[PDB]
Design an enzyme around this catalytic site. Sequence first.
Site, PDB file in Angstrom:
ATOM      1  N   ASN A   1      -6.228  86.197  68.489  1.00 24.71           N
ATOM      2  CA  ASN A   1      -6.187  87.632  68.471  1.00 24.71           C
ATOM      3  C   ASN A   1      -6.611  88.396  69.725  1.00 24.71           C
ATOM      4  OD1 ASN A   1      -8.906  87.474  67.969  1.00 24.71           O
ATOM      5  ND2 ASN A   1      -8.838  88.481  65.956  1.00 24.71           N
TER       6      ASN A   1
ATOM      7  N   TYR B   1     -21.181  83.326  69.062  1.00 21.62           N
ATOM      8  CA  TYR B   1     -20.712  83.337  67.683  1.00 21.62           C
ATOM      9  C   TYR B   1     -21.757  82.928  66.637  1.00 21.62           C
ATOM     10  CZ  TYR B   1     -15.872  84.329  69.170  1.00 21.62           C
ATOM     11  OH  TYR B   1     -14.736  84.995  69.615  1.00 21.62           O
TER      12      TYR B   1
ATOM     13  N   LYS C   1     -10.012  86.998  75.506  1.00 23.86           N
ATOM     14  CA  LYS C   1     -10.115  85.544  75.225  1.00 23.86           C
ATOM     15  C   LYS C   1      -8.985  84.747  75.884  1.00 23.86           C
ATOM     16  CE  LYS C   1     -10.558  86.013  70.799  1.00 23.86           C
ATOM     17  NZ  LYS C   1     -11.168  86.497  69.532  1.00 23.86           N
TER      18      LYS C   1
ATOM     19  N   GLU D   1     -24.969  90.817  73.260  1.00 19.56           N
ATOM     20  CA  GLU D   1     -23.820  90.170  73.907  1.00 19.56           C
ATOM     21  C   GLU D   1     -23.775  90.356  75.422  1.00 19.56           C
ATOM     22  OE1 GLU D   1     -20.314  91.522  72.096  1.00 19.56           O
ATOM     23  OE2 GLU D   1     -20.600  90.289  70.309  1.00 19.56           O
TER      24      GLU D   1
ATOM     25  N   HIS E   1     -12.120  90.443  72.102  1.00 21.19           N
ATOM     26  CA  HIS E   1     -13.327  90.593  71.316  1.00 21.19           C
ATOM     27  C   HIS E   1     -14.000  91.872  71.777  1.00 21.19           C
ATOM     28  CE1 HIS E   1     -17.345  90.150  69.740  1.00 21.19           C
ATOM     29  NE2 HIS E   1     -17.642  90.729  70.884  1.00 21.19           N
TER      30      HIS E   1
HETATM   31  N1  LIG Z   1      -9.729  83.247  59.102  1.00 23.17           N
HETATM   32  C1  LIG Z   1     -10.171  83.133  60.370  1.00 23.17           C
HETATM   33  N2  LIG Z   1      -9.753  82.182  61.210  1.00 23.17           N
HETATM   34  C2  LIG Z   1     -10.145  82.185  62.521  1.00 23.17           C
HETATM   35  N3  LIG Z   1     -10.943  82.971  63.217  1.00 23.17           N
HETATM   36  C3  LIG Z   1     -11.341  83.918  62.339  1.00 23.17           C
HETATM   37  C4  LIG Z   1     -11.020  84.047  60.981  1.00 23.17           C
HETATM   38  N4  LIG Z   1     -11.621  85.143  60.446  1.00 23.17           N
HETATM   39  C5  LIG Z   1     -12.290  85.614  61.455  1.00 23.17           C
HETATM   40  N5  LIG Z   1     -12.175  84.949  62.620  1.00 23.17           N
HETATM   41  C6  LIG Z   1     -12.708  85.344  63.883  1.00 23.17           C
HETATM   42  O1  LIG Z   1     -14.155  85.200  63.827  1.00 23.17           O
HETATM   43  C7  LIG Z   1     -14.817  86.466  63.980  1.00 23.17           C
HETATM   44  C8  LIG Z   1     -14.895  86.911  62.605  1.00 23.17           C
HETATM   45  O2  LIG Z   1     -15.211  88.226  62.646  1.00 23.17           O
HETATM   46  P1  LIG Z   1     -14.991  89.212  61.392  1.00 23.17           P
HETATM   47  O3  LIG Z   1     -16.199  90.061  61.244  1.00 23.17           O
HETATM   48  O4  LIG Z   1     -13.655  89.817  61.499  1.00 23.17           O
HETATM   49  O5  LIG Z   1     -14.874  88.221  60.120  1.00 23.17           O
HETATM   50  S1  LIG Z   1     -13.795  88.285  58.915  1.00 23.17           S
HETATM   51  O6  LIG Z   1     -12.737  87.351  59.307  1.00 23.17           O
HETATM   52  O7  LIG Z   1     -13.369  89.707  58.899  1.00 23.17           O
HETATM   53  O8  LIG Z   1     -14.558  87.860  57.718  1.00 23.17           O
HETATM   54  C9  LIG Z   1     -13.826  87.287  64.815  1.00 23.17           C
HETATM   55  O9  LIG Z   1     -13.766  86.891  66.247  1.00 23.17           O
HETATM   56  P2  LIG Z   1     -13.992  87.964  67.445  1.00 23.17           P
HETATM   57  O10 LIG Z   1     -13.227  89.159  66.997  1.00 23.17           O
HETATM   58  O11 LIG Z   1     -13.483  87.238  68.647  1.00 23.17           O
HETATM   59  O12 LIG Z   1     -15.444  88.192  67.462  1.00 23.17           O
HETATM   60  C10 LIG Z   1     -12.515  86.848  64.093  1.00 23.17           C
HETATM   61  O13 LIG Z   1     -11.358  87.193  64.869  1.00 23.17           O
END
Ligand SMILES: Nc1ncnc2c1ncn2[C@@H]1O[C@H](COP(=O)(O)OS(=O)(=O)O)[C@@H](OP(=O)(O)O)[C@H]1O
Lengths: 150, 150, 150, 150, 150, 150
Positions: free
Chosen positions: C114, C51, C11, C128, C117
């Site tokens: 983070n 997303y 990212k 995807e 992905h």
């Molecule tokens: N709190 C919060 N704030 C911002 N962004 C967030 C947040 N929680 C999840 N994400 C991002 O959205 C995707 C969520 O994937 P997850 O399955 O990990 O959801 S969870 O957060 O565990 O409920 C995943 O993005 P990708 O990993 O890029 O697909 C997360 O990194």
Amino acid sequence: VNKERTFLAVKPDGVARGLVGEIIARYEKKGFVLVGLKQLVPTKDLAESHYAEHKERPFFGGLVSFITSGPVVAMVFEGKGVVASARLMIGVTNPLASAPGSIRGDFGVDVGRNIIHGSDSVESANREIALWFKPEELLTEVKPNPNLYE
Amino acid sequence: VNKERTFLAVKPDGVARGLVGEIIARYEKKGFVLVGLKQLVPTKDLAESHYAEHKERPFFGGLVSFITSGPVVAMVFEGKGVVASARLMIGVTNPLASAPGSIRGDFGVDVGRNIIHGSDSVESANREIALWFKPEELLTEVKPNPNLYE
Amino acid sequence: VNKERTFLAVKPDGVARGLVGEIIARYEKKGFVLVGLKQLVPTKDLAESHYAEHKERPFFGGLVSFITSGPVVAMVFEGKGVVASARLMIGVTNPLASAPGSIRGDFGVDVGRNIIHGSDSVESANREIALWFKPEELLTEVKPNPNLYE
Amino acid sequence: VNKERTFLAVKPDGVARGLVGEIIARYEKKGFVLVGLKQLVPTKDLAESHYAEHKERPFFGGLVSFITSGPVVAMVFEGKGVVASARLMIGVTNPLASAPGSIRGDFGVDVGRNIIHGSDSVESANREIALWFKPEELLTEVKPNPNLYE
Amino acid sequence: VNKERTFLAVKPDGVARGLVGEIIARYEKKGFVLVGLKQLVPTKDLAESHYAEHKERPFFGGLVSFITSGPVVAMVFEGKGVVASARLMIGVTNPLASAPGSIRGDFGVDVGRNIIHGSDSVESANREIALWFKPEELLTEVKPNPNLYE
Amino acid sequence: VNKERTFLAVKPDGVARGLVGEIIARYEKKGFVLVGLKQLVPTKDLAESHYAEHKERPFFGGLVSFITSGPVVAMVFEGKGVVASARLMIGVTNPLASAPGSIRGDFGVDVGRNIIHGSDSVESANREIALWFKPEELLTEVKPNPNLYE
Ligand SMILES: Nc1ncnc2c1ncn2[C@@H]1O[C@H](COP(=O)(O)OS(=O)(=O)O)[C@@H](OP(=O)(O)O)[C@H]1O
Ligand SMILES: Nc1ncnc2c1ncn2[C@@H]1O[C@H](COP(=O)(O)OS(=O)(=O)O)[C@@H](OP(=O)(O)O)[C@H]1O
């Protein structure tokens, strides 16, 4: 030919400072194949013989003593122009004049403790090998990554 | 200006030997920005056109074949003096004569399989880029680490 | 089968912080073959679609915006159990809970930024991939180091 | 006591993929002393004897063949809890289930080609060592970095 | 808040073994900002005070002695959740039980010489910091890579 | 004598780009002992005095300004020929002209932001040291790895 060989030996200071894997890895990454490898503590006889051409030099004394003051990882690599490339990668006698990127340049400081030895010529290669390795201890065949040579 | 660009391409052996990441990381660590990137298998047409200046050379035969015998990661970097710097970092044609620290000097061994290609002049850069990349595949704007230039 | 694939995408924060090569190198060292690679800046459409399953989540807003705030190095690796291994190597959502050794654990700190992905399931993989890559951009064949599998 | 020893051996794929240096470096960085080291091609006899406890297992067939299909770097390390530590660092049988940071977890992918072998118990260590190494090939005394133990 | 801080200190063994740069780089890569740094030899007074909570513990004698037997590189990092992140990165008390990837797991072997110290809680951080750094020696302001936090 | 010293200082760009640990590790690996270390923001007074010899040089204005625009990690290493070795390792003024392997050659691109400063001669060392470190902040004694010198 892609079958040239050289004799390398991480001396007592490289070994004690934990530089064995780092030094081996550099050669592996380059493309040379390990053909023999072993650890031993050199005997006065082996040291003198190994250092024959420096018999009457002020430093021969210390070379022999130190190279037998501990374990030495002797090894034999193989590959096109390995003898020239090895020395190049090792650096120059004085670690302080050795450019960064080379072994002595990156890790060395005192000529007395310059980490490694590399054969200077295919002639010293063939001799040094036959001195440290019973022919049985060397691969009778070698197959390098086909992506290495044409 | 801090907008000069060069074309680089990890050749089939770089790619096959798994040196794509290391090669990119070296230029990322240097301070240059990736403006384009992509992987593909060059066509005889592109290879020949890419190697135009070596049309009647004995090696051109093998150049075109190999660079098309597999995937190539074409890429375009940007930054001050990137063309002269890239080449310096890449090393010299013969990997054996390339100093440690350079790409070819750390991982190459045969002139035939020397890992990567870098544009030699801003002139060849502009052309080489225009050959492998449709202008749409290139960043229209770039913003390097502010800690990089004055 | 040793032909499973996953979609990975460094990212905007991984890209800007210069982590492209490091991240690619980790996968190359593991044994997976790159099957497609390219750099682009995602469009709102692509981001939303990508997303989709987080359409009505408080964070969906920011995910879409940020992932289109800059270049993204999209890529597709291939190899046995690549989807499970990739995620494993990536770490867990929160970089701070990610163990050392993983990508997010070693380089990340804010869940908002983070770095990378990775597809969560072969199902999200297949979708995807078909979203970010025209089939033409993926190797029709793949030959991994024979030393990798039995 | 700070004299426990374990037997390790980079298998044909570790050796062929050029991971000898990295593997050794990891244990050198840890604080363990190399007490023996050597490269050779195991004989059907040694492989079978080495893999005794798996005589009537479906995989034993392939174990003995592969470990003899090429050079192996056998080696013996020493230090406090070296046996439990080596295994931890090596990872789990299936490289895919091995956490990042471990040997198998960072470079392995198939259970068939999982790079290295570490003795599982001090019991198997004592035996495995005695099998691959004549007692003459092992340091009679060891002196680790004084900064390592209390 | 992304301004939480922790006290880290490379103990005499980490300092003597030449692990200072490696340890700092690990945190620098993670995202934390160095807010204070300095090398000093702890005085009995400081060691005792620093180890107050283990006053009548069997090991308390050696902790104070060892940590004053040489230079300690004291440092204060800053970032969201640094205290729980630093600790995770350091590993657990026994380096043998530390997972690969962690400082202690990658380089340590004895509980007595376990390389580095990290505050256990923000409570201890504030205290420890106030003990080894005069407020003047800590950055009054911090600006982390914008690609780090949301 | 193996007690010569040099003043090194990671400038604001090296500090901000997160190169502190990498730069220290390079010298730690080489064999030099850290004798003093600390992070501070230079005051105009110190920058000017430190750059005295370039008082009426066109670039003098920016040198003083930049080196006080943020934290500088000042350090003093010790070892045989450290001053000529540190300089070699740092590279030459223009990072573009620095050979790969050197600090500036691996990470720098603009003369204005060239990461680090190393004393040019023992004359300047003694001076520079005396300018950034109160004698109390430097080790009164040093004991380098015995495997380093003869
Ligand atoms: N709190 C919060 N704030 C911002 N962004 C967030 C947040 N929680 C999840 N994400 C991002 O959205 C995707 C969520 O994937 P997850 O399955 O990990 O959801 S969870 O957060 O565990 O409920 C995943 O993005 P990708 O990993 O890029 O697909 C997360 O990194
Ligand atoms: N001054 C001095 N003191 C101690 N040891 C020394 C000295 N000069 C050379 N040597 C070591 O002896 C070998 C000499 O090889 P050279 O061909 O480099 O000789 S010279 O020093 O360049 O004249 C060579 O050892 P190996 O490299 O292990 O073969 C040198 O490192």
